[PDB]
Design an enzyme around this catalytic site. Structure first.
Site, PDB file in Angstrom:
ATOM      1  N   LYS A  31       7.328 116.994  36.641  1.00 33.91           N
ATOM      2  CA  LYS A  31       7.523 117.934  35.545  1.00 33.91           C
ATOM      3  C   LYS A  31       8.761 117.599  34.723  1.00 33.91           C
ATOM      4  CE  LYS A  31       8.408 122.769  34.412  1.00 33.91           C
ATOM      5  NZ  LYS A  31       8.485 124.184  34.874  1.00 33.91           N
ATOM      6  N   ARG A  83     -30.212 140.330  52.721  1.00 34.11           N
ATOM      7  CA  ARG A  83     -28.825 140.261  52.281  1.00 34.11           C
ATOM      8  C   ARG A  83     -27.937 139.688  53.373  1.00 34.11           C
ATOM      9  NH1 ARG A  83     -24.156 143.360  52.539  1.00 34.11           N
ATOM     10  NH2 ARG A  83     -22.810 143.255  50.684  1.00 34.11           N
ATOM     11  N   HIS A  86     -19.486 148.330  43.214  1.00 30.56           N
ATOM     12  CA  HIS A  86     -20.432 149.384  42.872  1.00 30.56           C
ATOM     13  C   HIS A  86     -20.631 149.530  41.370  1.00 30.56           C
ATOM     14  CE1 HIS A  86     -19.793 150.696  47.109  1.00 30.56           C
ATOM     15  NE2 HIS A  86     -21.048 151.088  46.982  1.00 30.56           N
ATOM     16  N   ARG A  88       8.068 118.314  40.855  1.00 28.64           N
ATOM     17  CA  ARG A  88       9.146 118.766  39.980  1.00 28.64           C
ATOM     18  C   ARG A  88       9.681 117.616  39.140  1.00 28.64           C
ATOM     19  NH1 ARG A  88       7.918 123.436  39.025  1.00 28.64           N
ATOM     20  NH2 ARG A  88       5.967 122.301  39.437  1.00 28.64           N
ATOM     21  N   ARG A 117     -12.107 146.759  45.193  1.00 24.51           N
ATOM     22  CA  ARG A 117     -13.371 146.214  45.615  1.00 24.51           C
ATOM     23  C   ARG A 117     -14.478 147.202  45.377  1.00 24.51           C
ATOM     24  NH1 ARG A 117     -14.155 146.726  51.778  1.00 24.51           N
ATOM     25  NH2 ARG A 117     -12.942 148.466  50.935  1.00 24.51           N
ATOM     26  N   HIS A 161     -23.933 135.748  55.799  1.00 26.98           N
ATOM     27  CA  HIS A 161     -23.799 134.846  56.904  1.00 26.98           C
ATOM     28  C   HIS A 161     -24.617 133.704  56.392  1.00 26.98           C
ATOM     29  CE1 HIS A 161     -22.974 138.754  58.156  1.00 26.98           C
ATOM     30  NE2 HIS A 161     -24.057 139.018  58.858  1.00 26.98           N
TER      31      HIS A 161
END
Length: 1019
Positions: free
Chosen positions: A92, A240, A919, A89, A914, A245
């Site tokens: 800033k 996949r 999709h 701050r 999602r 993983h």
């Protein structure tokens, strides 16, 4: 540890006690006091930072916050990060002293709110750090600082790959659907989610389905085969999972295929090409003023072998620029008419070399091996010292260099490759210097005409050809196997985004494991575009639409899949039989008529045994060579016949075409009696919609997007209204011959004026803008902007109409929807990747109890499946007691990650952010229910749990438009929301930016209007 200080925070973070504890540590600081202490302007100024730190006075001097202790290790960190942030701050504060922010405050109410996040970021970063390590097996004790940057390129790659699974998953839902109802209607092969049936969906478009029947994924009664679920899904679900993983392990032990199904892919990559002479769309025959030289390329000959012909040496992609470079590098030839038509010359040039490279290495010794040498002998000679030519230098040298590469010097592999490329250019310039010799010829159209002349000459042009050997693709892995299937089901725009990431990840690890699948990916790409460039244009050809639609309607009557040579022999038997009996005049064939079966004999596989016959003697006179060359010939002429069936069907559809014929007319037809001369020679030729309609390339390819009736809409009216006179009235036609090249020509040369950039760019502009005139670009009165800008605005206006007319805007929008969805899908796959880092991170601190692992589930976090077995049955981490889950969820809820099920990631179906992105609905169903700006906002809020993901997506999305509009990269740093209000927020992106003088550029404005219209539209 450290490892503990995180643990303390979580107990507080969950319990909502850090906030009070953070707030009180601020009162003791003491925050209110300081501003009165220095706030009102800081002094003269002055405004020197040096005057600070008053803070030590503030904190030392707190007074000292008492003696060190007694808070113990744990609360000193809160004061330590608060001092760190209060410096921020105060870091800033002095941004006002040099500007035009104001100066004002750090009110306590604000500061804790900012501070809470820094604390929350502090612990969440470490959790994921321990998560990232454990997930991938990395060791904290010894970890390189290289081994990270070699991991950042896999973790970076994995997202582009995971999305490649997601986009393919989409492409199969376009052609498949659930047999029977489920909670969520979009299948997830790779779920694995292996199930019945599933079942087929409407039997078109037959582009994907020929692929899916080519591979035995359908028994052509249209009932999904057994191989689909036994291999395709079961591999992709395993592969996949290897990615999501981090699995380093042998490849599920052995895997299908046993190389009999590797061949099922390769045969596909062969039979999507066209005859060396189906392809004169390159207009090779126009070479015209030359040359036999094309003829010279074929004559040398080559053969297939067990191994190591053209395998070790670099793939072509690398010699592509230099072969491209050399023709350009010479100034011997001069700039062509704008291309458009310049390309047609180049494309032929590139194609020829692609084959030329292929011939040279498969070359066997030619003649006596002299004079000039077979290309390898000379390569081997350069590699060896004098008198050491021959032996297997290439096979060994690459291996030596992988050993060289293996050691770690990262330029070793690359150095060998650069050694081969350079020899080829040397090999090409001495032996084939003439090849790049150029007349060149008429610039265009007149250069055309001809191209036209060969066309409509059904009798031979007579067209030249390049002897086309046949492809040796190879799939060594199972990983190279599905990526080669996935590209045979995706767009070129989708293959290219992962190919360039396979390549970019190659150069990062300096490795080349992925170098073969790249070439396979670069292979499939090039066979598609030729087929969309060759067939459509002047092939079957658009013209006489009302009549052509009739022909394809007749073409409807049974066609399926690519078909084996012996399977062809059985199906056209009587025709092959009758064609042989009419070729053998001796009455010996009378015995051969009936006994032609058995006596001749998946891909041939031809022989004459000949046994199972008893009258060998009557049969014998016919001989063998002359018969197995006259069936094998026959199947050559009834396997291309069904190949041209592939083109007439497939690419050209009766229903596809009608849409084109209908769509154009809505632009053509008059609004009154008036006879619209405009759109003459643009949509149709001189006769009247009579009709012939000229091929507008960008319309046909985008028909049946589908649907594009939401995409074409943004351009539908803007096309009709525009005064398209680009061809007329010869005020304009000359504009193309000279004006577009001339104005375009002038600027680049000006463009090249730098150096020097600092004030020759600035100085030269002022001299032409403001004073008198100069004639550097002398013919036109360069400078004298009154005579140029006026000159420019006429070339800008013509081009802007031409992009509306030629339906070019159909592609930018169709590619914005692919690019935008992809860069959002990556985030969703990034969020699921980050989920594994949190669950492994928390367990490693003992904060969370896990039972074991559930391979084949993919998702890290449990979805609330009905009703009470969700913590173990539905997730990768079985999670022990329910209480272990409820604790896990509260910690996640402590950060910006809710697993609650009210909102916003487990919402029913498609409500979920999602689900909508992963999709791939932005590209397949745009403009419905949810805007595109609404979805970019929903993504980023989901990823607001980490401070380093701040504004992450808002910038990721907008570089799609980086080429069409100039972005405001300093407005991407403030805090904003797109979908909620802020339509006047952009500003973020501002009009392009055309050239050195800051000429406006055409279309810069429209795209800004179009790029926005895209983002907010919602239907």
């Amino acid at each position: 540890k450290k490892d503990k200080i995180v643990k303390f925070f979580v107990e507080n973070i969950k319990n909502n006690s850090i906030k009070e504890k953070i707030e009180k540590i601020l009162a003791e600081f003491k925050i209110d006091e300081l501003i009165k202490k220095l706030e009102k302007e800081l002094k003269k100024g002055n405004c020197d930072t040096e005057i600070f730190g008053i803070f030590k006075k503030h904190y030392k001097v707190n007074f000292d916050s008492k003696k060190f202790s007694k808070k113990s290790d744990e609360e000193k960190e809160l004061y330590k990060i608060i001092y760190r942030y209060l410096k921020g701050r105060i870091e800033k504060i002095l941004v006002n002293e040099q500007k035009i922010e104001i100066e004002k405050i750090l009110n306590e109410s604000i500061l804790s709110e900012k501070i809470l996040k820094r604390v929350k970021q502090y612990t969440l970063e470490h959790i994921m750090y321990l998560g990232k390590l454990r997930h991938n097996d990395i060791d904290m004790t010894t970890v390189n600082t290289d081994d990270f940057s070699r991991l950042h390129a896999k973790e970076e790659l994995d997202l582009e790959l995971i999305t490649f699974f997601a986009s393919t998953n989409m492409e199969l839902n376009k052609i498949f659907s659930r047999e029977n109802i489920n909670n969520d209607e979009n299948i997830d092969f790779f779920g694995g989610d292996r199930e019945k049936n599933y079942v087929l969906d409407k039997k078109i478009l037959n582009s994907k389905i020929k692929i899916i029947r080519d591979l035995d994924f359908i028994d052509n009664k249209n009932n999904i085969t057994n191989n689909f679920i036994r291999k395709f899904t079961k591999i992709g679900t395993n592969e996949r999972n290897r990615i999501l993983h981090a699995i380093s392990k042998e490849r599920d032990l052995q895997g299908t295929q046993d190389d009999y199904n590797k061949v099922i892919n390769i045969i596909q990559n062969l039979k999507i090409s066209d005859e060396e002479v189906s392809k004169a769309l390159n207009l090779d025959v126009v070479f015209k003023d030359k040359k036999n030289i094309i003829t010279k390329i074929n004559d040398i000959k080559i053969s297939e072998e067990n191994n190591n012909d053209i395998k070790y040496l670099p793939s072509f992609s690398k010699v592509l620029p230099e072969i491209l470079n050399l023709y350009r590098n010479n100034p011997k030839n001069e700039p062509f008419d704008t291309i458009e038509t310049e390309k047609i010359v180049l494309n032929a040039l590139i194609y020829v070399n692609k084959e030329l490279y292929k011939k040279l290495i498969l070359e066997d010794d030619l003649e006596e091996n002299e004079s000039k040498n077979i290309f390898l002998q000379e390569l081997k000679k350069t590699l060896g010292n004098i008198d050491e030519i021959d032996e297997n230098i290439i096979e060994n040298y690459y291996k030596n260099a992988q050993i060289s590469a293996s050691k770690g010097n990262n330029k070793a592999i690359k150095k060998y490759q650069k050694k081969v490329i350079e020899c080829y250019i040397g090999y090409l310039r001495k032996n084939y210097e003439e090849l790049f010799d150029f007349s060149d010829f008429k610039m265009n159209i007149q250069e055309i005409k001809k191209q036209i002349k060969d066309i409509n000459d059904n009798k031979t042009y007579e067209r030249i050809t390049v002897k086309t050997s046949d492809k040796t693709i190879v799939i060594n892995d199972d990983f190279e196997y599905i990526i080669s299937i996935f590209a045979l089901l995706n767009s070129n725009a989708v293959i290219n985004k992962i190919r360039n990431r396979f390549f970019a990840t190659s150069v990062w690890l300096n490795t080349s494991e992925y170098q073969n699948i790249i070439d396979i990916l670069d292979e499939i790409m090039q066979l598609n575009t030729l087929r969309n460039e060759c067939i459509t244009e002047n092939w079957n050809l658009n013209l006489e639409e009302f009549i052509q639609k009739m022909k394809e309607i007749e073409k409807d009557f049974d066609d399926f899949k690519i078909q084996t040579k012996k399977e062809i022999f059985n199906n056209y038997y009587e025709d092959i039989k009758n064609n042989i009996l009419t070729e053998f005049k001796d009455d010996i064939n009378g015995c051969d008529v009936l006994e032609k079966k058995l006596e001749k004999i998946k891909f041939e596989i031809d022989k004459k045994s000949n046994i199972l016959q008893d009258e060998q003697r009557k049969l014998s006179n016919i001989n063998k060579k002359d018969l197995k060359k006259k069936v094998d010939q026959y199947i050559k002429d009834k396997d291309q016949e069904i190949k041209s069936k592939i083109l007439c069907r497939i690419i050209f559809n009766s229903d596809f075409l009608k849409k084109y014929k209908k769509e154009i007319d809505n632009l053509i037809e008059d609004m009154e009696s008036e006879n619209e001369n405009k759109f003459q020679e643009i949509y149709y030729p001189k006769e009247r919609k009579n009709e012939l309609y000229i091929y507008k390339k960008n319309l046909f390819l985008n028909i049946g997007n589908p649907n594009f009736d939401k995409i074409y809409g943004l351009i539908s009216n803007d096309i009709k209204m525009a005064d398209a006179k680009f061809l007329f009235n010869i005020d304009g036609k000359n504009i193309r011959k000279n004006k577009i090249s001339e104005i375009d020509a002038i600027l680049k040369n000006l463009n090249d004026k730098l150096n020097g950039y600092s004030k020759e760019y600035k100085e030269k502009y002022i001299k032409k803008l403001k004073e008198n005139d100069d004639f550097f670009a002398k013919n036109i009165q360069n400078k004298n902007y009154k005579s140029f800008e006026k000159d420019y605005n006429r070339v800008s206006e013509y081009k802007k109409i031409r992009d509306l007319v030629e339906f070019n805007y159909l592609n930018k929008i169709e590619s914005y929807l692919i690019d935008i969805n992809w860069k959002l899908a990556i985030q969703m796959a990034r969020f699921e990747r980050d989920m594994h880092y949190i669950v492994n991170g928390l367990r490693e601190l003992g904060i969370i109890k896990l039972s074991g692992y559930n391979t084949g589930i993919s998702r890290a976090y449990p979805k609330r499946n009905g009703s009470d077995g969700f913590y173990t049955t539905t997730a990768y981490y079985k999670f022990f007691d329910e209480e272990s889950y409820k604790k896990f969820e509260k910690i996640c809820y402590g950060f910006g990650i809710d697993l609650s099920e009210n909102s916003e990631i487990n919402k029913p179906e498609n409500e979920s952010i999602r689900n909508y992105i992963s999709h791939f609905y932005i590209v397949r169903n745009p403009f419905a229910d949810y805007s595109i700006a609404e979805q970019i906002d929903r993504v980023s809020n989901l990823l607001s749990y980490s401070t380093r993901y701040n504004n992450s997506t808002y910038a990721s999305v907008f570089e799609v438009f980086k080429k069409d509009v100039n972005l405001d990269y300093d407005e991407l740093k403030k805090k904003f929301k797109l979908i909620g209000n802020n339509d006047i927020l952009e500003r973020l992106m501002k009009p392009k930016k055309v050239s050195v003088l800051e000429l406006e550029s055409y279309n810069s404005d429209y795209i800004k209007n179009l790029i926005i219209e895209l983002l907010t539209k919602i239907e």
